[PDB]
Design a protein around this ligand. Structure first.
Ligand code: PTY
Ligand code: ERG
Ligand code: ERG
Ligand SMILES: *[C@@H]1O[C@H](CO)[C@@H](O[C@@H]2O[C@H](CO)[C@@H](O)[C@H](O)[C@H]2NC(C)=O)[C@H](O)[C@H]1NC(C)=O
Ligand SMILES: *[C@@H]1O[C@H](CO)[C@@H](O[C@@H]2O[C@H](CO)[C@@H](O)[C@H](O)[C@H]2NC(C)=O)[C@H](O)[C@H]1NC(C)=O
Ligand SMILES: *[C@@H]1O[C@H](CO)[C@@H](O[C@@H]2O[C@H](CO)[C@@H](O)[C@H](O)[C@H]2NC(C)=O)[C@H](O)[C@H]1NC(C)=O
Ligand SMILES: *[C@@H]1O[C@H](CO)[C@@H](O[C@@H]2O[C@H](CO)[C@@H](O)[C@H](O)[C@H]2NC(C)=O)[C@H](O)[C@H]1NC(C)=O
Length: 1101
């Protein structure tokens, strides 16, 4: 055939490889000999079997073979890439029709006085080259963790750049002895020179499959798109749905513009009758025996009061009061703790120079003198320094101190060039390895990657000691940083492990609790003052003592069962019971007071029973409504607020019993002792005149409800940390510092359980660096989630490292004494030990990889490798990432990490990313564990839950009210207004700035309970009226507001207003945001609906 190159004619110059000898195209080389053909087929491939007029010689082919092994090990990972290299070079020399696409631009005279090619030109197009570049575009150099394109192609980004390096003449570097140029353009209208072409193989090519890490095409691009989770259009989807609903409703209204209860009442009527008889029975006993009942109450308080002091008055800690012990995210933590040890105990310290760079020699000199002090010679009260508690990657290794000081091995740098040294270490961490041999990324050590201009740098200390000794040192560290003096202009914010626990139980704001009672006491006397003008001080005091006695009795009774109340939640209860407890006091006394001027025939004792009997149903409903709502709220599994419901349910039942059996007896004596003479409009006539505009009132409020109904989807989620801890604390500074001066997120450990990892089938679902690994393997899937999910850090796959550790290429990694299975000790420097796997036994397609028993035999060697000579030694990094018993690997951990997570919207989102991915592997028995997952487990289903609980409460009210009221058309109206209030509160919940948590969920669940109190009294009076009042609706509602309106304004509304008004002045910001705003807004809204909407609504019921 036409050969443009055949044979060699000596070296161009001294110490130079022999160059090819140019020959004319017409010249016909001799047919390939048997000896030559044998080498060509094996070196290049089977395609050269049939070639006859090959343009190569024995010395020419071997020369190419010698140089191929220079690069073959560097691209052997991708079989497709390897094939292309061989074909390009093999056809570049031995192609039969070489002259078709090969031209010799220039020639030179060799030392042997023989012409030798100096410049070579080859004709192709940008199709073979373009595909060839694509195949090796993404190949990764595992050893350096960088692209092999950097070395082989000089980091070429385009095919021209890559092939330019290949065609460059670098004989000294082993490159092409003579310059080679590529001619992509080839017109050849005369059909003289034909273009270069052959069979290309991409990474995805089935025959020559390639791993995902070496090419994206073979990687699981089949990612099911996830979307439609936020909204549609510029507004929430729900809002649009409701808005269109109104429009269609208006159209129906526009179209129309042109134009048994009594059967069951028999049992229900008798049901209330039996209720009155029983209640009247209690009244007579409690009034006729004001000593046997009063005395036992005092004694009962002592028994419960003593129990609190003696048996238990304890509290809890964050993990025991914000995460349920039955949730999956907690049962998974216990598994992780038992096997892979509890997570470390961080001590992050931030050094901040807001408004300027922080890194200066005086600052660096100052810090180095205190970082060493903390981690070397601090010592707790028991003399246990950091070195006795630090985290050591192995038996012997310097303590892990993730700080920028470790770049200099902990020694002060010289002032002459300290700036330059740090920049180089930060840019290339591997060079400046710390004392414990672990590179420190600049993101984990500075606020940004510029370092020099960084505003703050982080200093993380890790403790692997989980005994009480570690707690004492942390207390010493906290007391050492608070009293530490910093240079002018800086600022230190830190957080030990015990800081949060110590700071939640530190806002002893009990002072405000006393004031609220005292403020309520002042009002209580005024509210209960005799209509004549006399003030009954004893009744007001007796009312408060009953409330306090209920809490004391409730705590004692529940202390026996072992419940513990947190300090933060133990301060709300006094406010809550005061708000609701005193509410019944005014009614019972007010009804008796009304009976003072009427029915004068009855004596003091007789009148009392009448008041109790008359109000028996109204009060009882306020109890069943104030007890069912709390019990409903107990369905929240967070122990801090689950105990809040239970501690409040018993603090109202006991109060209810006390107010019916104890307080009445006090009234039996105080009134009897007084024996007052028989007791015989402004700002009121104006009322009931504004209510004449019934139709207008409904329109305004109905518009308010519908408007508030579209803003619900804007309610935020999450409980901010800075609220929980007291203000003016050292944790609020830290939390504001993590959200701004941190660049590394929490780690996530993708635990895997009950996997053989000794069978080729199972090993293929984890590996992600070998061609035959399953596409949907763990390493492969997580690789793609990096660009789509919150888990965006490289996976520390131990299995991949274990296999590569056996690579015969790395002779220093796996070594065995010849003829024996004993691992060759590192001391032996001679060639008395061979690699564990022979050259022909280790292939990238996992051909002869360890299997069955062999897998565990070599796992012991890898896990115990020194790691010093071979960087892939797994002892240091994966010492505690495996759980094995020399027969199988019980469990393993693949570490990853999220991105900084600069808010509570990221914390919730990050949690679902760890739960979604862990559910994408139906075969693997896997779960993802990050330290913060347990705390954010409620937000996964808080949306559906807050509708079931609040929705279930409203249905409950419609049922108990229906029985007690006996009038369905009235109970439904009551439920329609309570649900109206909640939706309005839900909208204002978003506007004000409150979030939806377990704390806010229970507050909103008990809002219906409070909301029913305002409205139930009006409905009850309206439903049942004296014969004198007209049976028409308009007069009946007017009558009710004139008989019970006064009590509602004073007893029901103003009482709660004073109870919660003082709660605004609270040291802890959690009380103000969640307990005050929610309850203060409820009173305003409920006081409007109950007193302006419910009257108007009932008029035209
Ligand atoms: C006669 C007695 C029996 C009557 C029948 C039962 C009545 C039950 C009424 C329940 C009222 C619930 C009020 C909840 C207020 C707080 C809501 C907080 C936010 C919330 O639930 O989630 C957002 C919106 O939810 C949503 O889906 C928003 C819609 C919530 C319901 C809207 C009001 C329902 C009707 C009220 C009147 C009933 C009259 C009864 C006479 C989520 O937002 P996202 O979708 O972006 O988040 C997707 C991720 N989770
Ligand atoms: C510096 C090296 C390590 C970089 C470039 C990577 C791979 C090297 C080994 C590759 C890249 C291009 C290759 C190359 C270019 C061209 C020729 C001319 C041909 O007639 C014989 C093979 C030969 C001589 C090979 C030898 C191996 C080379 C030089
Ligand atoms: C009912 C009260 C006692 C609750 C709301 C107050 C505080 C505790 C129980 C809870 C509420 C929110 C929790 C919380 C919020 C967010 C974070 C950030 C995360 O990276 C670590 C856990 C951490 C730091 C935890 C710690 C425990 C907290 C602060
Ligand atoms: C914090 O950063 C500033 C910014 O350079 C350091 O220097 C100050 O720079 C501002 C702005 O030029 C000047 O107004 C101050 O007078 C500088 N103060 C100095 C030089 O002490 C500052 O030193 C840094 N704080 C430290 C190192 O503690
Ligand atoms: C955590 O640190 C403590 C304190 O050093 C260790 O407790 C010591 O254990 C040794 C056992 O040889 C005793 O001799 C000491 O008296 C203990 N000291 C104290 C203060 O109790 C504990 O062993 C460490 N735990 C771990 C898991 O390393
Ligand atoms: C993985 O690749 C190796 C290497 O090719 C295969 O083992 C044999 O390799 C020799 C030399 O290349 C071939 O002549 C043999 O034909 C190969 N064996 C077979 C069965 O073809 C090994 O087979 C490959 N394994 C898989 C699963 O493809
Ligand atoms: C080593 O530990 C593993 C734990 O992963 C044991 O796993 C066995 O797994 C099989 C298959 O699921 C079960 O039928 C066995 O009951 C498991 N063993 C036990 C003890 O539960 C494995 O058996 C252990 N082997 C040795 C020699 O201890």
């Amino acid at each position: 055939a036409t050969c443009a190159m055949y044979g060699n004619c000596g070296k161009k110059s001294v110490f130079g490889n022999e160059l090819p000898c140019p020959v004319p195209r017409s010249f016909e080389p001799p047919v390939l000999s048997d000896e030559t053909s044998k080498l060509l087929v094996e070196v290049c491939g089977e395609e050269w079997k049939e070639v006859r007029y090959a343009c190569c010689t024995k010395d020419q082919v071997v020369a190419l073979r010698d140089n191929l092994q220079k690069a073959q090990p560097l691209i052997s990972s991708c079989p497709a890439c390897l094939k292309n290299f061989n074909n390009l070079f093999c056809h570049f020399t031995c192609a039969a029709d070489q002259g078709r696409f090969v031209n010799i631009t220039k020639v030179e005279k060799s030392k042997e006085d023989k012409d030798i090619v100096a410049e070579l030109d080859v004709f192709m197009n940008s199709s073979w080259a373009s595909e060839f570049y694509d195949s090796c575009k993404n190949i990764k150099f595992s050893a350096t963790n960088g692209y092999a394109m950097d070395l082989i192609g000089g980091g070429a980004k385009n095919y021209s750049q890559f092939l330019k390096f290949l065609g460059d003449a670098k004989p000294m570097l082993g490159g092409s002895p003579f310059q080679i140029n590529y001619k992509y353009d080839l017109a050849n209208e005369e059909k003289e020179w034909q273009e270069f072409n052959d069979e290309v193989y991409a990474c995805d090519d089935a025959q020559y499959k390639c791993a995902c890490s070496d090419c994206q095409e073979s990687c699981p691009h089949l990612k099911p798109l996830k979307d439609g989770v936020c909204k549609v259009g510029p507004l929430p989807c729900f809002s649009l749905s409701v808005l269109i609903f109104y429009t269609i409703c208006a159209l129906f209204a526009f179209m129309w513009y042109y134009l048994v209860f009594e059967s069951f009442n028999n049992e229900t009527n008798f049901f209330n009758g039996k209720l009155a008889n029983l209640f009247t029975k209690v009244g007579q006993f409690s009034v006729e025996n004001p000593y046997k009942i009063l005395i036992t109450t005092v004694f009962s308080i002592f028994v419960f009061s003593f129990i609190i002091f003696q048996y238990a008055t304890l509290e809890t800690d964050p993990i025991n009061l914000w995460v349920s012990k039955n949730s999956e995210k907690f049962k998974e933590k216990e598994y992780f703790d038992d096997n892979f040890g509890p997570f470390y105990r961080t001590e992050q310290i931030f050094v901040v120079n807001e408004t300027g760079p922080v890194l200066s020699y005086e600052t660096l000199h100052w810090w180095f003198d205190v970082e060493n002090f903390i981690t070397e010679e601090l010592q707790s009260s028991e003399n246990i320094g950091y070195q006795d508690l630090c985290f050591r990657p192995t038996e012997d290794s310097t303590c892990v101190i993730e700080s920028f000081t470790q770049y200099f091995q902990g020694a002060l740098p010289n002032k002459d060039s300290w700036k330059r040294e740090l920049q180089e270490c930060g840019k290339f961490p591997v060079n400046c390895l710390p004392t414990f041999q672990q590179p420190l990324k600049t993101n984990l050590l500075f606020s940004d990657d510029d370092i020099l201009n960084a505003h703050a740098f982080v200093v993380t200390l890790l403790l692997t000691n989980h005994t009480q000794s570690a707690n004492r040192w942390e207390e010493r560290l906290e007391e050492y940083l608070l009293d530490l003096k910093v240079p002018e202009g800086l600022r230190i914010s830190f957080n030990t492990e015990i800081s949060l626990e110590k700071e939640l139980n530190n806002n002893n704001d009990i002072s405000t609790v006393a004031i609220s009672y005292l403020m309520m006491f002042l009002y209580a006397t005024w509210a209960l003052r005799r209509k004549d003008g006399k003030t009954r001080l004893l009744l007001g005091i007796s009312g408060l003592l009953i409330v306090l006695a209920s809490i004391v009795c409730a705590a004692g009774f529940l202390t026996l069962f072992g419940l513990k109340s947190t300090l933060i939640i133990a301060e709300v209860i006094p406010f809550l019971i005061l708000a609701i407890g005193i509410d019944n006091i005014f009614l019972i006394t007010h009804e008796y007071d009304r009976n003072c001027e009427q029915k004068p025939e009855y004596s003091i004792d007789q009148k009392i029973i009448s008041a109790i009997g008359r109000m028996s149903p109204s009060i009882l409903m306020s109890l069943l409504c104030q007890t069912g709502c709390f019990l409903i709220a107990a369905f929240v599994t967070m122990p801090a607020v689950h105990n809040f419901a239970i501690y409040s349910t018993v603090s109202v039942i006991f109060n209810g019993v006390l107010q019916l059996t104890a307080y009445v007896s006090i009234l039996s004596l105080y009134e009897k002792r007084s024996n007052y003479k028989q007791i015989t409009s402004f700002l009121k006539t104006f009322y009931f005149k504004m209510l004449t505009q019934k139709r207008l009132i409904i329109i305004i409020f109905s518009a308010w409800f519908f408007t508030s109904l579209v803003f619900l989807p804007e309610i935020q989620f999450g409980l901010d940390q800075t609220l929980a801890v007291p203000q003016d604390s050292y944790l609020v500074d830290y939390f504001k510092d993590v959200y701004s001066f941190l660049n590394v997120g929490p780690p996530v450990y993708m635990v895997v359980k009950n996997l053989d990892l000794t069978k080729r089938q199972n090993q293929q679902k984890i590996c992600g660096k070998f061609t035959t690994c399953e596409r949907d393997s763990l390493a492969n899937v997580l690789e793609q989630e990096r660009h789509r999910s919150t888990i965006t850090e490289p996976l520390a796959n131990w299995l991949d490292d274990y296999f590569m550790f056996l690579n015969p290429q790395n002779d220093q990694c796996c070594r065995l004494k010849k003829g024996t299975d004993e691992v060759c000790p590192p001391s032996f420097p001679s060639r008395r030990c061979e690699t564990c796997f022979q050259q022909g036994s280790w292939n990238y397609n996992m051909s002869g990889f360890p299997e069955g028993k062999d897998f565990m035999e070599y796992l012991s060697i890898w896990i115990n490798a020194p790691s010093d000579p071979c960087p892939l030694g797994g002892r240091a990094p994966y010492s505690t990432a495996l759980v094995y018993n020399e027969t199988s690997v019980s469990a393993s951990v693949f570490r990853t990490a999220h991105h900084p997570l600069r808010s509570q919207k990221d914390f919730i989102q990050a949690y679902s990313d760890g739960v979604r991915i862990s559910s994408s592997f139906p075969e693997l028995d896997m779960f993802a564990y990050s330290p913060f997952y347990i705390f954010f487990v409620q937000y996964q289903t808080l949306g559906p839950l807050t509708l079931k609980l609040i929705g279930s409460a409203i249905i409950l009210i419609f049922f108990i009210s229906s029985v007690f009221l006996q009038n369905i058309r009235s109970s439904f109206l009551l439920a329609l207004v309570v649900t109206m209030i909640i939706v309005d509160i839900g909208a204002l919940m978003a506007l004000l700035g409150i979030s939806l948590n377990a704390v806010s969920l229970v507050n909103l669940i008990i809002c219906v309970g409070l909301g029913v109190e305002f409205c139930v009294h009006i409905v009850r009076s309206f439903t049942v009226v004296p014969s004198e009042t007209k049976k028409d609706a308009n007069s009946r509602v007017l009558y009710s507001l004139n008989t019970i309106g006064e009590s509602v304004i004073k007893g029901i509304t103003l009482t709660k207003f004073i109870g919660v008004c003082v709660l605004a002045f609270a040291q802890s910001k959690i009380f103000d945001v969640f307990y005050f705003r929610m309850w203060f807004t409820l009173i305003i809204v409920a006081a409007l609906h109950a007193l302006l909407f419910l009257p108007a609504l009932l008029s035209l019921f």
